Amino acid sequence: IVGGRDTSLGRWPWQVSLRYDGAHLCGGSLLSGDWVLTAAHCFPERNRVLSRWRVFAGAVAQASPHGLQLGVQAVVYHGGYLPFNSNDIALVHLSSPLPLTEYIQPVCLPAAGQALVDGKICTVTGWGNTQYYGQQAGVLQEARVPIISNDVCNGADFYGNQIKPKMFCAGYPEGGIDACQGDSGGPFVCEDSISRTPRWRLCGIVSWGTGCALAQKPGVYTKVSDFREWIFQAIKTHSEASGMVTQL
Amino acid sequence: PLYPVQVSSADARLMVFDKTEGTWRLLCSSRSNARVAGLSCEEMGFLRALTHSELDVRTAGAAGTSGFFCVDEGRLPHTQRLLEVISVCDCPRGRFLAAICQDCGRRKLP
Numbered sequence: 378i379v380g381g382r383d384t385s386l387g388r389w390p391w392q393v394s395l396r397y398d399g400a401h402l403c404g405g406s407l408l409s410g411d412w413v414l415t416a417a418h419c420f421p422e423r424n425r426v427l428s429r430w431r432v433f434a435g436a437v438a439q440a441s442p443h444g445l446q447l448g449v450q451a452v453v454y455h456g457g458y459l460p461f462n463s464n465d466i467a468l469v470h471l472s473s474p475l476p477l478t479e480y481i482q483p484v485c486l487p488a489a490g491q492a493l494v495d496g497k498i499c500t501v502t503g504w505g506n507t508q509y510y511g512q513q514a515g516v517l518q519e520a521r522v523p524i525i526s527n528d529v530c531n532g533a534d535f536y537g538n539q540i541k542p543k544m545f546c547a548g549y550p551e552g553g554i555d556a557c558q559g560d561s562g563g564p565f566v567c568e569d570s571i572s573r574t575p576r577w578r579l580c581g582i583v584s585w586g587t588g589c590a591l592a593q594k595p596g597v598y599t600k601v602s603d604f605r606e607w608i609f610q611a612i613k614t615h616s617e618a619s620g621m622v623t624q625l
Numbered sequence: 626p627l628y629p630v631q632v633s634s635a636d637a638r639l640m641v642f643d644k645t646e647g648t649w650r651l652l653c654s655s656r657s658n659a660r661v662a663g664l665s666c667e668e669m670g671f672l673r674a675l676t677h678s679e680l681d682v683r684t685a686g687a688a689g690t691s692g693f694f695c696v697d698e699g700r701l702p703h704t705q706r707l708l709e710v711i712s713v714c715d716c717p718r719g720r721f722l723a724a725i726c727q728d729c730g731r732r733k734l735p
């Protein structure tokens with residue numbers, strides 16, 4: 378996250394780090410104690426040996442000795458992710474559930490029919506680079522960015538027609554604050570009180586962009602509301618699965 | 626802005642908005658309660674229902690609702706949204722569904 382600040386313990390209790398052979402590669406969001414929602418592009422051919430993946434949770438410092446690290450039982454990715462950028466979403470089933478404490482909590486999904494409010498300012502968190510030719514963050518960072526409309530983002534001055542309908546952009550026309558390498562798979566959350574209680578919901582998954590924090594090249598997120606049914610299905614369908622499976 | 630389907634934080638009873646009344650109605654208990662509790666939790670943005678039970682208007686009260694809604698069980702398994710398979714009804718038994726959905730999106734610090 379470029380242009381963000383260090384956050385503290387328990388503020389974004391759903392954030393997890395996905396590490397492969399020791400290195401933090403992507404971010405993820407806990408949907409329950411045993412399921413994490415991330416991006417399909419985090420599991421390319423060379424990173425598909427589940428035994429080499431760990432999910433770190435409950436800490437904001439990557440080197441905290443007080444966070445938990447569990448294994449992965451299975452990864453269910455979206456069969457429509459042609460690269461294997463639309464349908465850049467995947468579910469990770471942990472080998473055992475995480476306890477839910479004041480530092481490990483699941484995030485909510487958008488309600489049925491709940492749509493994105495262009496202009497609304499949401500938060501994006503992660504441990505990715507704080508500068509494109511920079512290093513990852515040692516402490517989880519958080520930043521606030523508004524949703525940009527598709528008419529603006531698909532303009533020839535932004536991403537000239539590359540933003541397909543199940544993705545959206547968030548950021549400042551000016552650049553300055555954005556997600557970057559290492560934040561992929563992580564959470565883009567907005568808070569609302571439609572359930573009469575304020576709750577944070579996962580509206581996007583950090584997916585891609587051109588460089589980081591440049592003006593007119595905002596970040597692109599997977600729009601979670603359009604995958605609600607895929608997620609409900611996948612979880613029922615593959616609860617007892619092991620391996621890399623794909624669901625469309 | 627309120628979402629048409631709500632669940633009580635006092636006794637988890639489900640309430641569905643009746644736009645012709647501007648009131649919330651309870652969901653009459655049926656043999657499909659588990660599917661209805663699961664579908665109501667998904668609808669609202671929760672991942673699943675952990676459990677559900679049956680309350681009795683006579684021992685629990687109405688808590689400001691006006692009537693009941695019943696679910697067309699035969700159509701229930703074709704649905705994605707609850708509001709398309711529900712109808713006002715009399716619910717003679719006076720027993721409704723309560724659903725405990727997985728909690729989410731809230732910080733638990735002091």
Ligand SMILES: NC(=[NH2+])c1cc2cc(-c3cccc(-c4ccccc4)c3O)[nH]c2cc1Cl
Binds near residue numbers: 403419420555585588
């Ligand atoms: N500026 C942005 N809006 C942005 C930039 C990047 C850059 C990346 C990224 C770059 C190189 C490699 C990976 C990667 C590849 C495989 C596994 C894990 C990460 C990235 O996610 N992801 C990004 C996501 C976003 Cl919104």
